[PDB]
Design a protein around this ligand. Structure first.
Ligand SMILES: [Cl-]
Ligand SMILES: [Cl-]
Ligand SMILES: [Cl-]
Ligand SMILES: [Cl-]
Lengths: 162, 162
């Protein structure tokens, strides 16, 4: 019944995250460093930047979902707070590939241990008071939102496959 | 309790559809016909093609979700079954803009009348027998999937804004 239904909608949301994650991971693995460094389209973000961006955004989900601290806080100034052509030094690409992999794996670990119910609790960026009015502003809503963020950028990364 | 929880996860899924739909619609409205006709990136699909593609894919959700027949079946051969540079004649762009708008509005109408429970029934492309094993293969799973499909293509349409 109701406990089972809650488990089914967590499955749906997690299956979409996992599908986008698989596609993103496989795409990144398929590209050489030289191919990743190219702009996704003229004047637009490089694959390297999008990799770092996705990594930083996913890492930030850890504290937002009360699943632990970020692993790599120094990525956020480079890949969230500043644009690609900022002139700020980036990590080497193979280090970014590893950070991506370790953030994704930590999230998978943590997600796989959460009970369906925990997903319906508030995320860290909303007050208890505001969550009462809008209980849809929960941890699952973050998962859903970031899954679409990833899909959006995956459409751009797709243009690096020549 | 459980009826309320079911309503909250429909809200979450529909809010994501509506957010992507808003962003897509506003982007399309912001582009001139000449700007939409340009390739999203060198050698890649035009905005026109992606508009027709999104329209056809969304129209196909009507029968899949048992919400009525497709409005514009002739779009599917042009924008789903064949690629952009097929040489097949396309509708005029302003006709495509209208088809997009009418499909989106029909879907909104229909979605706004469905009860949360109806979203947890099977979609038209799975058997009752197979749905018993995998009840997550429901109407909501289609909504979620097509929301990420739209986000993916929205990332590409974004590159038409010069
Ligand atoms: Cl995808
Ligand atoms: Cl490339
Ligand atoms: Cl978006
Ligand atoms: Cl353009």
């Amino acid at each position: 019944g109701m406990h089972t239904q809650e488990a089914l909608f967590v499955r749906l949301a997690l299956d979409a995250w996992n599908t986008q994650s698989s596609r993103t991971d496989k795409l990144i693995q398929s590209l050489s460093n030289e191919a990743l460094a190219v702009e996704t389209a003229p004047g637009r973000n490089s694959g390297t930047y999008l990799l770092g961006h996705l990594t930083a955004v996913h890492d930030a989900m850890l504290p937002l979902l009360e699943l632990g601290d970020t692993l790599y806080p120094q990525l956020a100034p480079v890949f969230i707070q500043n644009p690609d052509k900022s002139g700020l030094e980036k990590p080497e690409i193979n280090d970014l590939r590893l950070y991506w992999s370790l953030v994704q794996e930590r999230l998978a670990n943590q997600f796989n241990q959460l009970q369906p119910a925990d997903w319906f609790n508030k995320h860290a960026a909303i007050s208890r008071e505001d969550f009462l009015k809008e209980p849809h502003r929960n941890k699952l809503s973050v998962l859903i939102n970031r899954t679409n963020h990833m899909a959006y950028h995956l459409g751009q990364l797709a243009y690096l496959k020549k």
